[model samples]
Target chain A: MTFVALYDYESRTETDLSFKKGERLQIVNSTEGDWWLAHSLTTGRTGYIPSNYVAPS
Target chain B: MTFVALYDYESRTETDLSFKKGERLQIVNSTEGDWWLAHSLTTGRTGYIPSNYVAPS
Candidate 1:
């Protein structure tokens, strides 16, 4: 349940998250690689995303 | 797979898509109504979306 998967980075396996895009991830997983963690100064919630589900960014 | 699913219509059942957002659909369906069809001048692709899976925008 990755959200706001950005596809601008070099390796598609990694991507960025943006609360500005109004996207969110509603997941039911607790594994380490299940989601990528990100932080924001404006948006407090951590950005979590899956590896395969994300793009280059 | 649907792309750029928009959620900005009268009902939650419908949505609009903008290629400006840089999204694309890659489905393997043949149903005429399996997706929402839209036109774009700047982006040369139809805005295809489903009836569900979208919120009020």
Candidate 2:
């Protein structure tokens, strides 16, 4: 699945993915909870982001 | 890190971890978002759970 970033987030950990607002994200895995594992389609990086921070694309 | 489950969840997804209240969970990866990769410390089984479902232990 694809998602669009609704907010800018600079990740704090090495396992986190960082991206600016309005960026495209390709979901690697998203089951439940608030977080999803994905890669930044625009930035070409992979990490975790708040599931609510993005909208379905 | 270890966490304690606050609520019982019957996982529908195979990748999602199923557990009951007061269960011990071992966090495998917790970067951001609401979801975290973990294993049930009670059984050493691996799966994902919402971060909000558990409390730091």
Candidate 3:
């Protein structure tokens, strides 16, 4: 499944995920964990995004 | 090893990786293959980049 963030999120910590507005992300992992692995459609980077910030699209 | 691209390459094929100039990429895979799986430090996307396009930094 894939989701989009309502707004841009800047990671506060080293492990946090950072993204700009309107970036497309393909969900590679799960919400069961605090962080989810997602592939950036725009940047092509795979990183951890907070599950709370995203909603399924 | 990580490398930096001298130029930007727009993916010619569907499986190819697209990266902009000066983007930092971490080599997660290999050179033996024509395409290498790399983590884009700038975009945070994991995709296949041509080995020839990047030089180890």
Candidate 4:
């Protein structure tokens, strides 16, 4: 069931960590809760985000 | 960089969007507003979400 990564929590903060439209990141780690698992394949960086933001193809 | 799609507007609602660590989706369409473009590669569907949801690899 855990396929996509979500990030519906930054609506209040000012970080504006929103991605554009054609952005693709790598899967680094996912705790299986609010955030899932994802990494910036281009930057090779990893971070935690909500679950609804990502979808596996 | 406009490489990843974001979903920052869902925080105000029940739709909690915040990527965890791993997830991947295809780009369907993006209007360039608060929401962006994303397609469910698994489901083969498309939708719009805040900008802070998707990222690039």
Number of the top candidate by TM-score? Answer: 2
Output the lDDT of residue B31, model 4: 35
Off by over 4 Å in 1: A1-33, A40-44, B1-57
Q: Whole-model lDDT for model 2 versus the true structure?
A: 0.45
Ten-residue region with minimum lDDT total, candidate 2 chain B: B43-52
Show pairs that collide, candidate 2.
Answer: A34-B34, A35-B34, A35-B35
lDDT of 3 by residue, A1-57 (tens): 333434555544333345554444443333322333344444767443333333443
Candidate 2 lDDT tens digits, B1-57: 334445555544333455555554443454433555444443333343434334444
Residue-by-residue lDDT tens digits, candidate 2, A1-57? 334455555544444455555554443444544545444443343444434334444
Reproduced native contacts, each prediction: 0.00, 0.06, 0.00, 0.09
Candidate 4's error at B33, in angstroms?
33
Top candidate on lDDT is: 2
CAPRI grade of model 2: incorrect
Instruction: Put down candidate 4 lDDT per residue, A1-57, tens digits, no spaces.
Output: 122434432233342233333434233333322342234453443443344454443
Listed per prediction, chain B TM-scores read 0.21, 0.49, 0.48, 0.32
Candidate 3 lDDT score relative to the true structure = 0.42
Q: Point to the candidate with the largest DockQ.
A: 4
* CAPRI-style class, candidate 1: incorrect
Q: Write the per-residue lDDT of candidate 3 for residues B1-57, one digit (tens) a residue.
A: 344444555544333355565554443333322333344454776433333334444
